[PDB]
Amino acid sequence: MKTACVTGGSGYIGSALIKLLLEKGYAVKTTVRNPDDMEKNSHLKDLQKLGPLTVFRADMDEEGSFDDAVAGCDYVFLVAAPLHFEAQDPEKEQIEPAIQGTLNTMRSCVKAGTVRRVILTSSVAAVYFRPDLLGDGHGHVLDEDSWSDVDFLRAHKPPTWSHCVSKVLLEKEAGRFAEEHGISLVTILPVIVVGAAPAPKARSSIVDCLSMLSGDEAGLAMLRAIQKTSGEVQLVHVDDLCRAELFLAENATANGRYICSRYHPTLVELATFLAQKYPQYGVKPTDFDDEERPRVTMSLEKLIREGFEYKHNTLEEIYDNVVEYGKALGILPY
């Protein structure tokens, strides 16, 4: 019986991953920042009914605090990550702490002497920002060879530039470290993640993918910004991401970084689907009418090439249970 650690069990994806790991007969270790906070961590007790689940206190800013949680683990899923904000000095308040916090947990993995693979959860935010391809007026298909352009981002500092830089640098730094330390690191790069999860305080991409139904202004801005940039948005169901994470850990031939994405609608397609299946929210699809732009899209081929299979393949399946989740979280009024 193998043992896996999921960092940040309080979080959206982390909670879905812990559940999947238990269903597959893994013993699971997870970290939160206050194990005594049973409002935020009630799901961790329920999940104990599926298999062995142990909770630890750890913080990415606190050197060595992950030592106990990763010890004895065959696999470690680095899911926990700091929330973004507009900081007065993003280099010092975000980019550097994101690198250092990643290395911090990397050290606990080496020290554990038992970790066969580290799976790093990053983001297509580390893939898509390409000044050439985005602005040249042509369509493009990006794959795992594409990296977000740190120099252009440091040089021009568009809003939220530090989020892409942090993902790029922490991935590079963690790979450098894994090479120099003889430990196997594989990285997954999700798009917008949709679907229900055990976490009772989840927000994150649930807010964004539901914003057409809720009217959340920041969610809608995010969706429109992505569409303005790429000609569409990209979605993946949370349970396919979790299955993809497990797949990358269990297949010895897995190597490098992997985009994780499944369905790429325009906002008007997405709004028409939501308006039709969930009319009680009053979506007006014409609010998302738009000119057809060049598609700058993520390729899904690498995971497929290697044998992975997605379970939620239509738009309806990707949205199969997220609305109910939104209601139970209060993100939706009813």
Q: If we measure between CA atoms, which residue out of 63, 75, 62, 259 comes closest to residue 171?
A: 259
- The reply to whether 191 sits near ligand DQH by the rule CB under 6 A is yes
The helix or strand, by DSSP H or E, that contains position 245, with its residue range, turns out to be helix 238-250
Residue keyed to tokens 């994470």? 245
Q: Which of 25, 82, 256, 307 binds ligand NAP (CB under 6 A)?
A: 82
Decide whether 104 or 205 has the Cβ nearer to ligand DQH: 205
HSE of 221, CA atoms in CB hemisphere, 13 A: 4
Q: Which of 80, 246, 283, 298 binds ligand NAP (CB under 6 A)?
A: 80
DSSP states of 33-91 as a string? S-TT-TTTTHHHHHHTTTS-EEEEE--TTSTTTTHHHHTT-SEEEE---PPP---SSHI
Sort 164 into a burial class: Cβ within 10 Å, 0-12 / 13-18 / 19+. Answer: buried
How far is residue 113 from each of residues 48, 64, 173, 186, 206, measured CA to CA in Å? 26, 14, 20, 18, 37
Measured between alpha carbons, how far is 150 from 28 in angstroms, rounded to an integer?
Answer: 36
Decide whether 117 or 264 has the Cβ nearer to a second copy: 264
The minimum distance between CB 218 and ligand DQH, in angstroms, equals 10
Decide whether 9 or 231 has the Cβ nearer to ligand DQH: 231
Q: Is 167 marked within a binding site?
A: yes
- The reply to whether 146 sits near ligand NAP by the rule CB under 6 A is no
Q: Is 12 marked within a binding site?
A: yes
**Dihedral over alpha carbons 44, 84, 244, 186 (to 10 degrees):** -110
CB–CB of 126/164 below 8 Å?
yes
Q: Which of 102, 146, 230, 266 binds ligand DQH (CB under 6 A)?
A: 230
Look up residue 94 and give its DSSP letter. Answer: I
Measured between alpha carbons, how far is 79 from 16 in angstroms, rounded to an integer?
Answer: 11
Site string for ligand DQH, 128-147 (x = CB under 6 A): x-------------------
Q: Which of 3, 41, 94, 121 binds ligand NAP (CB under 6 A)?
A: 121
Q: Which of 22, 69, 192, 298 binds ligand NAP (CB under 6 A)?
A: 192
Q: Is 193 marked within a binding site?
A: yes
- The reply to whether 90 sits near ligand NAP by the rule CB under 6 A is no
- The reply to whether 308 sits near ligand DQH by the rule CB under 6 A is no
Q: Which does 234 bind (CB under 5 to 8 A by kind): ligand DQH, a second copy, ligand NAP, none?
A: ligand DQH
The minimum distance between CB 291 and a second copy, in angstroms, equals 7
Residues engaged in binding ligand NAP (CB under 6 A): 8, 10-14, 32-33, 59-61, 79-83, 101, 121, 123, 190, 192-193, 202, 204-205
Residues engaged in binding ligand DQH (CB under 6 A): 123-125, 128, 163, 191-192, 204-205, 208, 222, 226, 230, 233-234
